[PDB]
Amino acid sequence: ARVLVVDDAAFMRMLLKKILTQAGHEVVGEASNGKEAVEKYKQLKPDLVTMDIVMPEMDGITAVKEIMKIDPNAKIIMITAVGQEAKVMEALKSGAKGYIVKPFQAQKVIEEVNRVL
Amino acid sequence: ARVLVVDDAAFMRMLLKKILTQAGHEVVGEASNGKEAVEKYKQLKPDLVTMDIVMPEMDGITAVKEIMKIDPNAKIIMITAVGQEAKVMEALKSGAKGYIVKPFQAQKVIEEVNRVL
């Protein structure tokens, strides 16, 4: 009777939580995506999961492409950590204008925002 | 100076919003994933986007697989609409126990939760 509700739409989570709780079940957790669903399953060990078969599955690169398609003047800065450089490379190829590296130093972040503008 | 901040981690959004606002910039919106980033770009037409190159990119099927890997007794119900049947099929193959169809009738939803338990 302990249920993990997974859905990218907050209102869908709510609607399902309503129906479950109204049937005497306890929603012990919620997730907006795949990774979070799996993490929350470990931590909560629920009896039941409800999961939308559509989950956000758009990466940073293709979201750059979609935004550039909409507005070719879009100014995008990627947030990256060490190890993701191949993907950042391709984001920049696809129209992104810059990037900043985690962990942030506030000065370097604004140097880069300013540079882009 | 109007910035759309995109990152799957709420605290990362916050941290970046802090640094931007402290530099005299207006965070006019936020997104937790790819789809939402693109939608919000249209609606807000921001001067600047900041976007994590890692965005949730795990689909419902592979999140079923990861959960089954963790607990082979996991009980998962897929939420589906018309048109997604190929993906629901494969979710069930990978260990999911059932599904419910949107738009929900509360009775059919609990018939299916009960059946699974």
Numbering used by the authors:
A (entry chain A), B (entry chain A): 2 to 118
Paper quotes:
Here, we present single-crystal X-ray structures of CheY from Pyrococcus horikoshii (PhCheY) in two different crystal forms, and the protein purification, crystallization and X-ray data collection of CheF (PhCheF). CheA autophosphorylates and subsequently donates the phosphate to CheY, yielding phosphorylated CheY. The concentration of CheY-P determines the switching frequency of the flagellum or archaellum, respectively. We observe PhCheY to have a domain-swapped, pseudo-dimeric fold, which may reflect inherent properties of the protein fold but is not likely to be of physiological relevance.
In striking contrast to all of the known CheY structures, PhCheY adopts an open conformation in both crystal forms, with the two subdomains of a given subunit directed away from one another. In both of the two PhCheY structures solved in this study, two polypeptide chains assemble by pairing the N-terminal subdomain of a chain with the C-terminal subdomain of the other chain; i.e. the α3/β4/α4/β5/α5 part of the fold of each subunit packs with the β1/α1/β2/α2 part of the other subunit [Fig. 1(a)]. The crystal form with space group P2 contains three non­crystallographic symmetry (NCS) molecules in the asymmetric unit. Superposition of the three subunits shows differing orientations between the domains, leading to an inter-domain movement of up to 90° [Fig. 1(b)]. T. maritima CheY and PhCheY superimpose well, with the main deviation in the connecting region composed of the short helical segment of the β3–α3 loop. This region is unwound in the PhCheY structure (residues 54–60) [Fig. 1(c)], facilitating the inter-domain movement. In all cases, the rotational movement of the C-terminal domain was calculated after the initial superposition of the N-terminal domain. The connecting region between the β3–α3 loop is partially disordered for the two subunits C and E. For both crystal forms an unambiguous trace of the electron density in the β3–α3 loop was verified by a feature-enhanced map (FEM; Afonine et al., 2015; shown in Supplementary Fig. S2 for the P2 crystal form). Owing to a putative cold-induced destabilization of PhCheY (P. horikoshii grows at 98°C), and putatively further induced by the crystallization conditions, the PhCheY fold disassembles into an open subdomain-dissociated conformation. At the high protein concentration in the crystallization drop, PhCheY can then reassemble from this open state with a partner polypeptide to form a domain-swapped dimeric assembly that is eventually removed from the monomer–dimer equilibrium by crystallization.
